[PDB]
Amino acid sequence: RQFIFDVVNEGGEAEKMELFVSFCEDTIFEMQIAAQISEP
Amino acid sequence: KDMVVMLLSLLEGNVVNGMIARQMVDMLVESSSNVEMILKFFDMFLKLKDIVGSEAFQDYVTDPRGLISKKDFQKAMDSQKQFTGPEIQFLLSCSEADENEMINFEEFANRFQEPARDIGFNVAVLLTNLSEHVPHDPRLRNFLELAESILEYFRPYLGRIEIMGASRRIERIYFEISETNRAQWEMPQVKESKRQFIFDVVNEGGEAEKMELFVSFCEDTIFEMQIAAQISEPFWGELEVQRVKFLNYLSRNFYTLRFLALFLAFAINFILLFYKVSDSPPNMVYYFLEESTGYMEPALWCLSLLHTLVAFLCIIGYNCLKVPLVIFKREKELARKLEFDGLYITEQPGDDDVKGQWDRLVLNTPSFPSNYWDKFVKRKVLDKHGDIFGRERIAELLGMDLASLEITAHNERKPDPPPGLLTWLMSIDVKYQIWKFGVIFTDNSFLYLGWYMVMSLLGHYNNFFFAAHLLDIAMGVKTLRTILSSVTHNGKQLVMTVGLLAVVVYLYTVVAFNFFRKFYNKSEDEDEPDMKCDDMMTCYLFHMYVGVRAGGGIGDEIEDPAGDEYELYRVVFDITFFFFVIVILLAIIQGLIIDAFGELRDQQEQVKEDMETKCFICGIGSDYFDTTPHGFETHTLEEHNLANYMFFLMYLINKDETEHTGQESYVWKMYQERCWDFFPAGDCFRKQYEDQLS
Amino acid sequence: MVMSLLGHYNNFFFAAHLLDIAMGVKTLRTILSSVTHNGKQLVMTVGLLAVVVYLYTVVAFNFFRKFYNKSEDEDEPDMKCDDMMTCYLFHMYVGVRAGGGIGDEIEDPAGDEYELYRVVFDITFFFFVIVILLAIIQGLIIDAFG
Amino acid sequence: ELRDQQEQVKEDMETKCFICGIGSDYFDTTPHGFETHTLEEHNLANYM
Amino acid sequence: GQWDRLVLNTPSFPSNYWDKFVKRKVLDKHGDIFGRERIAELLGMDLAS
Numbered sequence A: 001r002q003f004i005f006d007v008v009n010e011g012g013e014a015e016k017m018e019l020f021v022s023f024c025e026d027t028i029f030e031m032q033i034a035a036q037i038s039e040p
Numbered sequence B: 001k002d003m004v005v006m007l008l009s010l011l012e013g014n015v016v017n018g019m020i021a022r023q024m025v026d027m028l029v030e031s032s033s034n035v036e037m038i039l040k041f042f043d044m045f046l047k048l049k050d051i052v053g054s055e056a057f058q059d060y061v062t063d064p065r066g067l068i069s070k071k072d073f074q075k076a077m078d079s080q081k082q083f084t085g086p087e088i089q090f091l092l093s094c095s096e097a098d099e100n101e102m103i104n105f106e107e108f109a110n111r112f113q114e115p116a117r118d119i120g121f122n123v124a125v126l127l128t129n130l131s132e133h134v135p136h137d138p139r140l141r142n143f144l145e146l147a148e149s150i151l152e153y154f155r156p157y158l159g160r161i162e163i164m165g166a167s168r169r170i171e172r173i174y175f176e177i178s179e180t181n182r183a184q185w186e187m188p189q190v191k192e193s194k195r196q197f198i199f200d201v202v203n204e205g206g207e208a209e210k211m212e213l214f215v216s217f218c219e220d221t222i223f224e225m226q227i228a229a230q231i232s233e234p235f236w237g238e239l240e241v242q243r244v245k246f247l248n249y250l251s252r253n254f255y256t257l258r259f260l261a262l263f264l265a266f267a268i269n270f271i272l273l274f275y276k277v278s279d280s281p282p283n284m285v286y287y288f289l290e291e292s293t294g295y296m297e298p299a300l301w302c303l304s305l306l307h308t309l310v311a312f313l314c315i316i317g318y319n320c321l322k323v324p325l326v327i328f329k330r331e332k333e334l335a336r337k338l339e340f341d342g343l344y345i346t347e348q349p350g351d352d353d354v355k356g357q358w359d360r361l362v363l364n365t366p367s368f369p370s371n372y373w374d375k376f377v378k379r380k381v382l383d384k385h386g387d388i389f390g391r392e393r394i395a396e397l398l399g400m401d402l403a404s405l406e407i408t409a410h411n412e413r414k415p416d417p418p419p420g421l422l423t424w425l426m427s428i429d430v431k432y433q434i435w436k437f438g439v440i441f442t443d444n445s446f447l448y449l450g451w452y453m454v455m456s457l458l459g460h461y462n463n464f465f466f467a468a469h470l471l472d473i474a475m476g477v478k479t480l481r482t483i484l485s486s487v488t489h490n491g492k493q494l495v496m497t498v499g500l501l502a503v504v505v506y507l508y509t510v511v512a513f514n515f516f517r518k519f520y521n522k523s524e525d526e527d528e529p530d531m532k533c534d535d536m537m538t539c540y541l542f543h544m545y546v547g548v549r550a551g552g553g554i555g556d557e558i559e560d561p562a563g564d565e566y567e568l569y570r571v572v573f574d575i576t577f578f579f580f581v582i583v584i585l586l587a588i589i590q591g592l593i594i595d596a597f598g599e600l601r602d603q604q605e606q607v608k609e610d611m612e613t614k615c616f617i618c619g620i621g622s623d624y625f626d627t628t629p630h631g632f633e634t635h636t637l638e639e640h641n642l643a644n645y646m647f648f649l650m651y652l653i654n655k656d657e658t659e660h661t662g663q664e665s666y667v668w669k670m671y672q673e674r675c676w677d678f679f680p681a682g683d684c685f686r687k688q689y690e691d692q693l694s
Numbered sequence C: 001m002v003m004s005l006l007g008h009y010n011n012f013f014f015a016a017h018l019l020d021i022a023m024g025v026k027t028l029r030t031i032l033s034s035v036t037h038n039g040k041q042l043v044m045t046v047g048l049l050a051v052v053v054y055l056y057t058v059v060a061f062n063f064f065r066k067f068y069n070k071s072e073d074e075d076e077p078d079m080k081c082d083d084m085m086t087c088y089l090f091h092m093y094v095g096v097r098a099g100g101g102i103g104d105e106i107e108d109p110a111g112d113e114y115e116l117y118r119v120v121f122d123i124t125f126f127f128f129v130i131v132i133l134l135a136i137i138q139g140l141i142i143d144a145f146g
Numbered sequence D: 001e002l003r004d005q006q007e008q009v010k011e012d013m014e015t016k017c018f019i020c021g022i023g024s025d026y027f028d029t030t031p032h033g034f035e036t037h038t039l040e041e042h043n044l045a046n047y048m
Numbered sequence E: 001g002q003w004d005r006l007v008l009n010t011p012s013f014p015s016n017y018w019d020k021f022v023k024r025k026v027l028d029k030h031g032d033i034f035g036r037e038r039i040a041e042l043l044g045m046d047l048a049s
Ligand SMILES: Nc1ncnc2c1ncn2[C@@H]1O[C@H](COP(=O)(O)OP(=O)(O)OP(=O)(O)O)[C@@H](O)[C@H]1O
Pocket: B611, B612, B613, B614, B615, B616, B617, B636, B637, B640, B641, B642, B643
């Protein structure tokens, strides 16, 4: 939600897909962090 | 280049997939080996120019003289992995080796750069022109790939615009942008001028005048680049060279002087904070600084003298930097209204326009177009309106000698220009200067700077007058000017609603003076009553001075009506005064300031939304262009860039008319006639050839 | 953490941790963003208020000094405008916070040779400082909300 | 509320024809098409 | 950008970022033009390893 708000509010059309891919990579890293800290 | 110019002429008025365009592609394929050799010639010396400037190349440079040997050049070049075997050998041959195999790489790199630039640019234009009009030819991209460095090098200088051409079709025009023109356009003050112009046209402008306003902005911008060039830096003659150097110094650093004047005002007022009034010398009283350092009293004198000097340089700097544009703009508009409207020939403004009436003084002056470049406007007006209104009458109005027109075209006279100050005295045009100073003295910025003068000199009379210069932060910082604009936006309403407050309070004064005079005793003394409403002027002053400023209205100040025959009448007096004046009327003042903040904010948003959603030139929305990915970004940067239209006009003005192409001549003729039909309106190259391009 | 450590030095330093509701509560964070959105404008308008109050202080110091006696005592007057720094502090401290401006605090000018000048002084101070500038501040907050 | 009413009336007049109701975008395909349409073709004064 | 210069020559620069070969890519991309040894010195790389 924060990413969507940021891009739609103060983003351009030329940088939109690059920002989206960067958000995807950051989300992928956060998923690894959450899996690491998760306990069985 | 002459051969390529002829080839480009064959492409004038060429449609996509035209016969001539596809024939020219066939000729290039037929001579592909020779074209590649030509292209490989340009990239080899374009690559060489940057390689010699690289740090890795400088590692092999060991000779203290600044040279490099062929065997060292050989091992340095192939270490860059950009040339083949034969290409390095060819560069060795082109290098002018001495008997010692010593190579001067500084002159080698720059030997062919200048001579090959003109042909290199036209080859880039030719390939760009063909690639955009034969977009589906497989045999053409290899040339483009082989010319990648040539195209990349000339990309900043390859200006392209679209016009509605002679054939009733949208045409794409390729021209050259000089390095100086692009550099000047990127200057920070020019960019700020562009932003101001864009805001004005989009916000409070119409579509009919949009192109005429844009061209006029281009002409004003072109004139400012001339001013910036002059003031830029790389016994009569000895003083003159220093005088112009000094004036250009003030012009270049005008805004630093404005900042330093503002800082000088804050420093002075900080010292003024230490002032103290005492009966003893340091029944009339003495003002003196109170400090223990002892250095602040002389500092105020030095700071006061310095402040006046700096503010003086601001006026001189303004007259040399901003005034020429003001005179240029006024001369330009007067010239076009003389020729294309017959202002003083046909309509004759009726004394209600101080601008039109004041411009009658300059019409007959010998130096009327002093800043505006068209020194022949009087000739043009005479040829246009002379026959119907009388040549001798127009010549009298414009101060022209009809007998002197022919002799100037007969031959040219070379008189003696004596470099004497005495001969300079009668060479000034008195009537023009009186007109020019009236224009300057009606300029707001000059008047503000002139006001800054008077207060600064008055500060030496009394140092507390320097406090007025602290108001410069309204103009000093752009932020505070924005908040202050939110007050002056509804200024006419602010004064009117105050005047309404004056009338409403007056009505309450009339009622009080007739019925409630007992309650206006403002004296705690019992023998000397201070009647505040035994006179209308006193009662009216009382209601405005204490009634408005009171939190609960007039009922707060006047006597308590408890247990009186007029109690219920007086309570209605008070809560209506409190509601109408304190609650409602003051809310109107607050609402007007609040409304202006919203009103100004949406104006910024409306301009930024129109710019990002429609093309400034053609007016087609971004939705149409976004069908192609990044379509609107490409359209506004390459196809309909408004900067390139500015660059084209400068290109047209400098190019010799005998060298104008058919498309350049077409636009130049229409520009001279002030006809803006060549600007694409509602149409574009992408739209016209939708079937062929897609 | 530093404030928590200082709370052991003095327990009243734990009051600073009550400010944590600004970021803990999203509603409070939004409300405070509605103030910090135009923070530069608010600081600039406060500076403009300081400048205009300074100008009024200069005028008062030059002309209206006799009205700044804030002592009901009769033989030792407490003149608030016999020094420019003291007069500026007095203005910025009492005139801004007064409902009707400086004229609420300073002496009544009735029956004086400078009566009209002083009433113009007071009325303009009230309109520019109390009304217009505070209205600017509240309008900035409302515009940030919008 | 009063300010936007003035702006809405001004925006509607400059973006649509008072008579036929076709927007300015359609007419602007021809250069200055909407200006000509409202001045010569569908001028409301001429209907008066 | 000035603070990011301290991490260029560190042996563990991409500790969290997964691309552990960014130095190799930068070398293969810019060593020919700006000097392989200079790039290796900038990025803290041993060319022999
Ligand atoms: N015909 C046009 N020419 C140029 N820009 C246009 C045109 N029509 C619309 N625009 C818009 O103008 C905007 C401002 O241009 P842009 O931001 O690219 O300029 P700049 O020189 O890079 O600098 P800046 O960011 O200061 O404007 C662009 O985002 C573009 O969408």
